[PDB]
Amino acid sequence: MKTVVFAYHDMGCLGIEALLAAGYEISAIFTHTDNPFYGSVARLAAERGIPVYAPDNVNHPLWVERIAQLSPDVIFSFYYRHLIYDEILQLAPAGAFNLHGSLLPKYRGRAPLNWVLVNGETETGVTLHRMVKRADAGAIVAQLRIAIAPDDIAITLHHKLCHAARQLLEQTLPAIKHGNILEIAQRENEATCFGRRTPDDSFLEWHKPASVLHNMVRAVADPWPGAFSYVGNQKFTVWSSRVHPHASKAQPGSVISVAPLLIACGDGALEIVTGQAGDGITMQGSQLAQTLGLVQGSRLRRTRVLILGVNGFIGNHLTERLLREDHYEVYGLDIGSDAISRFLNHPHFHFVEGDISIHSEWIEYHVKKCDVVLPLVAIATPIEYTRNPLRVFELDFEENLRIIRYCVKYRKRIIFPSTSEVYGMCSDKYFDEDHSNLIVGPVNKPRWIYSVSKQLLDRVIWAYGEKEGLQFTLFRPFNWMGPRLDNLNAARIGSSRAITQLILNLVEGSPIKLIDGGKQKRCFTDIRDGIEALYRIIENAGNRCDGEIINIGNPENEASIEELGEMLLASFEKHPLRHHFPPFAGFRVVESSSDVEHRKPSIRNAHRCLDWEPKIDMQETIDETLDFFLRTVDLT
Amino acid sequence: LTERLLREDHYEVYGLDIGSDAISRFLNHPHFHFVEGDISIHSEWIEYHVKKCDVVLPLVAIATPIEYTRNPLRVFELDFEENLRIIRYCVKYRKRIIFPSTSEVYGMCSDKYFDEDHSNLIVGPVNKPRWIYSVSKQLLDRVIWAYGEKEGLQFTLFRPFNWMGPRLDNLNAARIGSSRAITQLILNLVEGSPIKLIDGGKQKRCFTDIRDGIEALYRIIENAGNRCDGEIINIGNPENEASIEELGEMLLASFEKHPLRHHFPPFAGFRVVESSSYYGKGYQDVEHRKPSIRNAHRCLDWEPKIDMQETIDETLDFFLRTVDL
Amino acid sequence: MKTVVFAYHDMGCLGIEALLAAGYEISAIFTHTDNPFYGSVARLAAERGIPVYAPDNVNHPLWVERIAQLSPDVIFSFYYRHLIYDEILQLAPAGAFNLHGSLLPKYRGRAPLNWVLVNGETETGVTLHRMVKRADAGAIVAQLRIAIAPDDIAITLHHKLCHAARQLLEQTLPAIKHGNILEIAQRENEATCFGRRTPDDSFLEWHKPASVLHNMVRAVADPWPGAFSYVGNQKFTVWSSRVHPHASKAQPGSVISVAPLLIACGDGALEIVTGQAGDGITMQGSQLAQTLGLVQGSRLRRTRVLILGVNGFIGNHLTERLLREDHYEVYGLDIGSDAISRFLNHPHFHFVEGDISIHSEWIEYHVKKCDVVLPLVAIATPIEYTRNPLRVFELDFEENLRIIRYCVKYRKRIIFPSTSEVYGMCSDKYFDEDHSNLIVGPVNKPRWIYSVSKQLLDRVIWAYGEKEGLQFTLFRPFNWMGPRLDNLNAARIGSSRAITQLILNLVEGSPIKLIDGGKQKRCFTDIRDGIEALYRIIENAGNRCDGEIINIGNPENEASIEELGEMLLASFEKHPLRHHFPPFAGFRVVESSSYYGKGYQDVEHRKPSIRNAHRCLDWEPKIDMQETIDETLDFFLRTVDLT
């Protein structure tokens, strides 16, 4: 037969060897480059005079064409780490087979070797199965069981797996060269799956049974990263361990004896036979105890948030949210306190007077002083893009760039307000932070100066992230609304201008202008949801927000300006304070000069990073916003 | 440009740069003045020379794609910030600026003809950093524009499309205007390294003889009837459209028949490479770039006169004739 | 017996195992941490319940004490990489033995495994010998030969060596446990020694025979870094090769064929069987040829020196020297051109007008413009240290720091004139750049502000060298002298002030002042020698000057100020132009507290160590004192205007 092989490591090597020994013709081999014990598939391919390639993604059309030209009868996958998907998969008429390191359907995920040890399994094996859309789900062509001895560790079991695979292939590969194979479908309800392990998965938790922990060190034992724990601040690694069924009245985690080194567990005790302190050398347990400073009986500030432009919507709500919690210190920076005044006496709020266009050193100083930085100062007002482009550019770009560079210099985290306008004329149904292209008009359409300015900033922040190690998260708010809207002339980010305008229209008794009929649809977000998301961004649980760009918006709240008008009017007419304001001036259709056809965010990133979804329906948002606004208006 | 301007008698040229080697034949010319300078270092010397002169031509910038991803911050610092400094000198002293915008501002725009006044500008997500060059350059055009509208700056923006001819810039040079593709291929033939066709080299480009281009640029400097004021002008030849592959074939054909061929190594061949290999990751390419020269015709009464083949042959000829053997 | 073992890698492991099997008691084992295939000595020691340590230096007194406490009968070293010296070695009564990976005395150096493959040796072996002051020089207790097969590469031979080692130890270890030993002393004239290999040692030079190159690829083959070459700018590695004795008219380095891939050598051709392009994967030769862009056949401007303070002694002589050569372009920077005036018309000299205290961007610009930078502007005048400390500090420290930082920013090489004054009162017979302590007086003795200022600059440059990657060389001139001395009031580095002053004394008919009797001794250097050295530093052959501090002086030329006075006077009296000048006013002894102002402390001797100059520059001063004196005096007297 003719084959194209996808191979890596030992399984790849022995797979290929078995393939050649079976009289197969290997036309080409696809493999990987080596990251900083295993045999090389490339070295083998090279010695056998077989062309070998290592693209990052083999599913690129070019490689598909190349493989097509090679015209394989059957395809084989031996421990190829990158994912091969159907387009190339279906090119071989006899099909494609994969060699997997467990008893399938069980442990069909990745790194089965380690997982079967972690779970304390008494047996495992190797499976040759047919590939298909679902990972490792296809019909089993061949399988061979292996006993796991109590004293097996990762490497010994790995070699057992390799031997079993070599046997399996030796006997069942010849059958495939003919078609003398049976295909036994996998039982899907009996299946078990595991994901990729991180070294943090190897942390030893002493409240657990000694058995689980022994198994832990068995699973990751050298050459693997090893199971670890801490003595005070000092980290140490357990290379080999011994379970002690003999109990101890000592509570879990305490040191029973240093010779041997014995740690009390939830059930039984665990002896550390060998281990190492930090990056030092391996040594027997007793010496490790001495160098770690163990003896018999031994066991195992607020984040400063700087908000620039605190006086206003996001400043108010974010401050409230942050101070609700116990671990934050908030420094509000702005040219006035009028909007945030109720927080001025709060012990953990600090108002700092400053103006980012004038003050340089005061700002820099406060960036150094704090931990995370939130630059909310900028001109977001559309008429101002065209009326005063240079001032918009100076404030929104240059001053904020200075602030970003403060953050780069002092190694502080920056959470930066990008804009939904960055997407511009993009035609996608959902605006995707990571995918959607950004479309703007020609240079002669200056309204775009704002959108492009904000975009280039995102890119500079990005670069600083990549090259200088800046910790950042970009967020793009979509029409946030709620109590305490920013004034329309205000230089701070975050309040939807449209709603402010409509509400001010109803309050002032001026007409609601529907520009070009007001049929263009926007998405609106209750600030409770939005500020929840932003707060979640500040928290940065699991550091999942690092380098992330996250839309914060509610796609369920999509409405036209007309509909919005209708809703606010409906809420307005029935409101207890209605009698304080003029009769409704009516809806009035207007020409363009006197735009985006849809703005709908993809909130996938917010869900992924923040585990966040907007909980609040449109109506309550409309009602609460209008209510607070009307009750806030001064009357006489 | 110096050659063109000094041919006519009414121009006084102040050449500014950190070396004179490429322009050495103009150093003795009474109406040429070489001024020592670097726009990243010098502030006041540059400002002075802007006050002193009439029209200003800021050609310093990093146009080489690999550097966009490899050194984004320097690309941004030099191409955007230092040039903004110069633009602001011109605004302050009320001088005319003729600014080299880039064909790259259009990005992935799908129009058959890229139109200065009409075509939308399309770039990838922020996570596709190669666009930092394109967007940086675009934002400058907008700043220059704003100054034109609000503060009365006299300006003309021009976008060259693959200008080529004698005396191409070195590939690592921070100066604008010679096509990198052509330089790369000719250097490949000269050095005997293979010609890399990225993703098959099927993407099409338009090429322009430097004679036509410089005619256009000179005409922009002339500014007859002040017709270039506030104008954005493509300078390119749309009939010269060719893929990189075709370019390779043409150059190879011209190369093999050249009298000096025997002094250079055997052709290593065309070799197909994936985008991710040559430019690294986060790469996004333009499938077609064809300029609208309408504005050039309207403002400059200008049309490209030179056939592709003559351009190819002359460029290759001069380059090979300069090589030391 | 009791043992303390020094062990690393496979030889260490098998050594310890063989030692245990022989009934030794291992009290402790010394090893190394692992660098970011070989078996672990630490893990093994840990498994056997043997205490194991990995200090950076075992020869630290503490460890000597601890090893002493363990009280070993005999010591064994199996492939311990760090060096154990006699203090610890003499603790074991039965002695200390080392396991070495060659046939001794041959290849007694390090990496014998690789070296015996490089040289194409047909055999090698393992040797157990008795350690001593000289490395691997001791008496051979046991030795075992092993044949090197033509198809052996590094790893296979490594395993053979390990096998032979187990066998050797297995039979000869019991003999040591008793006291049955032969010592066949090593024959020193048969000895051969090799050092640590650097990847650059694996560079394939095609003008050599194919056999030698084949041997090269055999020696460094995987797991080792491999032998390499270049296609244009692209680096590639040859993992396996095949010699083709059939010759070819094709010149060395040309590609004979791509299938198989064949490179013509000085003798025969080398087939590349497998290899890789850059960091890519291994592949067969033809594919490697294809990805590198090879086909049949294929083979495999001037430096800008910026001198700040060019108008004067060093500027003049260095400019002359640099312009002698074809590959330099010199930019002289200063506030006047007179001293260098004859180079103003030279095509490759460029005078740049500038003042480092005023001009900022002009200086920065010229640093960017050039390649290597030489900051000679500074006040070296002793009286000025005490008279104008703040100006001396501002110019010598701050402005030069400005320049140094330019050099860091634009990634240019800086060759910086440190000063011999940095050593201060150091008592060493030879002032050593790398070793000697630096001694200055209390703060109330302000003359030291110059010395300490220059010292701190050297340290800041050093810091930039370590942390920010500055390429630098520091040089400390010792009383350079020759034609074209700087004026005594000049703010440039390099002319001996003392001799200038004495010559001026003789010319003006003023007395030669011997300060505190002029008993303090100095070393004097002909500018021919000095400028030779400085030129050698600029050349920077093999980049051997990188991060280096180099004294430039002549220690054979040593004289008290008195002796100098007498020599100069002697040359003066017999000179043809003597009669044009006044009678000698005589020598006048003066106390320090008058001439130099207050707070003065003088150094009794300054003798440079020129070891570093020899090592880095292959340099020695060639000019005798008398000739220097005569040339200097003659040139000076002949410049004087007479009327």
Swiss-Prot record, chain C:
Family note: In the N-terminal section; belongs to the Fmt family. UDP-L-Ara4N formyltransferase subfamily.
Name of the coding gene: arnA
Pfam families on file: Epimerase, Formyl_trans_C, Formyl_trans_N
Protein name, entry field: Bifunctional polymyxin resistance protein ArnA
UniProt-annotated site: Raises pKa of active site His, residues: 136
Job of this protein: Bifunctional enzyme that catalyzes the oxidative decarboxylation of UDP-glucuronic acid (UDP-GlcUA) to UDP-4-keto-arabinose (UDP-Ara4O) and the addition of a formyl group to UDP-4-amino-4-deoxy-L-arabinose (UDP-L-Ara4N) to form UDP-L-4-formamido-arabinose (UDP-L-Ara4FN). The modified arabinose is attached to lipid A and is required for resistance to polymyxin and cationic antimicrobial peptides.
NCBIfam families, sorted: PRK06988.1, PRK08125.1, PRK11908.1
Pathway connected to this protein: Nucleotide-sugar biosynthesis; UDP-4-deoxy-4-formamido-beta-L-arabinose biosynthesis; UDP-4-deoxy-4-formamido-beta-L-arabinose from UDP-alpha-D-glucuronate: step 1/3; Nucleotide-sugar biosynthesis; UDP-4-deoxy-4-formamido-beta-L-arabinose biosynthesis; UDP-4-deoxy-4-formamido-beta-L-arabinose from UDP-alpha-D-glucuronate: step 3/3; Bacterial outer membrane biogenesis; lipopolysaccharide biosynthesis
Annotated active site: 100, 421, 606
Residues that bind (6R)-10-formyltetrahydrofolate: 82-84, 110, 132-136
Inducing stimuli: Induced by BasR.
Effect of residue 100 to K: Less than 1% residual formyltransferase activity
Outcome after substituting residue 421 to A: 100-fold lower specific activity
Domain of life: Bacteria
Residues binding UDP-alpha-D-glucuronate: 380, 385, 419-420, 447, 479, 513-522, 600
Subunit note: Homohexamer, formed by a dimer of trimers.
SUPFAM superfamilies: FMT C-terminal domain-like, Formyltransferase, NAD(P)-binding Rossmann-fold domains
Segments for region (Dehydrogenase ArnADH): 301-643
Disulfides per UniProt: none
Binding residues for NAD(+): 334, 355-356
Catalytic activity: UDP-alpha-D-glucuronate + NAD(+) = UDP-beta-L-threo-pentopyranos-4-ulose + CO2 + NADH; UDP-4-amino-4-deoxy-beta-L-arabinose + (6R)-10-formyltetrahydrofolate = UDP-4-deoxy-4-formamido-beta-L-arabinose + (6S)-5,6,7,8-tetrahydrofolate + H(+)
GO molecular function, one term: UDP-glucuronate decarboxylase activity
The EC number(s) this enzyme carries: 2.1.2.13, 1.1.1.305
Region listing for Formyltransferase ArnAFT, in residue ranges: 1-300
UniProt entry keywords in alphabetical sequence: Antibiotic resistance, Lipid A biosynthesis, Lipid biosynthesis, Lipid metabolism, Lipopolysaccharide biosynthesis, Multifunctional enzyme, NAD, Oxidoreductase, Transferase
